[PDB]
Amino acid sequence: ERVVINISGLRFETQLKTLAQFPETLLGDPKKRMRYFDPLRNEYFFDRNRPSFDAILYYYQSGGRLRRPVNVPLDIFSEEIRFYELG
Amino acid sequence: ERVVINISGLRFETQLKTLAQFPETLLGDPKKRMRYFDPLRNEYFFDRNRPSFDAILYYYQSGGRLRRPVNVPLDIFSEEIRFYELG
Amino acid sequence: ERVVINISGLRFETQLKTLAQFPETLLGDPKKRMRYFDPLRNEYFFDRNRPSFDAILYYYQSGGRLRRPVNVPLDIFSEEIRFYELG
Amino acid sequence: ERVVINISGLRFETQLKTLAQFPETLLGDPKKRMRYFDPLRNEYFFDRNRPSFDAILYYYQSGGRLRRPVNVPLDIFSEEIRFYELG
């Protein structure tokens, strides 16, 4: 019921149901996240910006609240949002 | 005597006596926190905001000092404060 | 030649030589830091503020540069400085 | 195909090809980074500033975007920049 998301070495753990909330997104679509699944470690791996992920995951956990970590530039965080396809 | 608290993959460790300080809180109440306890991993697990937790734990360690992390929005942090029943 | 310092669950790793640079401090003095040694895990455990520690450790690594993390309140960081006895 | 980079206990993971992009840098030069490789743990280790590395690694992942973390002083980050040889 729980999933491990490895962002450049930083492991985040959440429930499937938390992600499955927004099925249109990369993480919420089994078809899309599959492409980042690592069978060797049974986790998803993204070679991307780490500080941005706290906010991406919180978007799901909070049921829709998307905020930019004051410590991550707007342009950088915007590219992350597009990548995770939250829009 | 060591307590392990897993916030979305981020591991925190403190002493039982540290949490015991405030028994009327979710973490200070063994009855309340047990609902998040994972016997097979010997840790409590919360599918919640990660940056907010440094301040939640500092509250107990400092003996009552509640500070909001400049990098966590007032409303987001206020939600966490409520959930952990610090009031 | 390496030592693990566990700050409330957050593991930091450094060389003995790095700490030794300042023998007058808590971590630089074998007799002082020994009180926090955890045999069962082969690491030194401190039930304290996590964000402050990045700067405490860097003070040794940099050979004497003490900077406050913009994200840690001055009064809070000051107390940490006293506890680690950097003065 | 994946490399582990231990920065004072904080583990980062990325793809060799990500680092290979800039062969003239310390991390991109297999001759320069070898000095920090720990054969035993199969990771590179640097006893350095932790907060600066998100930006150092991001430099590679972004294809050349070098941004200073708002929470890390200009002089400190410039020093890390010189060490990793990104200039």
3-state secondary structure A5-47: EEECCEEEEEEHHHHCCCCCCCCCCHHHHHHHEECCCCEEEEC
Other beta carbons within 10 Å of D17: 10
**Resolution of this entry, Å:** 2.1
- Alpha carbon distance B55, B68 (integer Å): 6
Question: Could you say which of A4, A61, A69 has the minimum Cβ distance to residue B48?
Answer: A61
Q: Are D26 and D33 in contact (CB under 8 A)?
A: yes
- Alpha carbon distance A58, A60 (integer Å): 5
Chain C residues within an 8 Å CB radius of D9: 4-5, 11-14
Q: How was this structure determined?
A: X-ray
CATH superfamily of B1-87: Potassium Channel Kv1.1; Chain A (3.30.710.10)
Measured at the CA of B8, the angle between CA D56 and CA B78, to 5 degrees, comes to 100
Q: How far is CA C52 from CA C7, C63, C66, in A?
A: 10, 18, 11
Question: H or E element: which one contains B31?
Answer: helix B30-34
Domain ranges of chain D: 1-87
* Residues 26-85 in A contacting D (C-alpha not used; CB under 8 Å): 45, 47-51, 70-71, 73, 76
Q: Are D52 and D82 in contact (CB under 8 A)?
A: no
Question: H or E element: which one contains B45?
Answer: strand B43-46
Question: H or E element: which one contains D38?
Answer: strand D37-38
Helix and strand counts by DSSP (H, E) for chain C: 4, 4
Chain C residues within an 8 Å CB radius of B62: 76
Going by C-alpha positions, the residue among A1, A40, A39 that lies closest to residue A20 is A1
Question: H or E element: which one contains B30?
Answer: helix B30-34
Question: Could you say which of A13, A18, A71 has the minimum Cβ distance to residue B9?
Answer: A13
- Alpha carbon distance B23, B19 (integer Å): 7
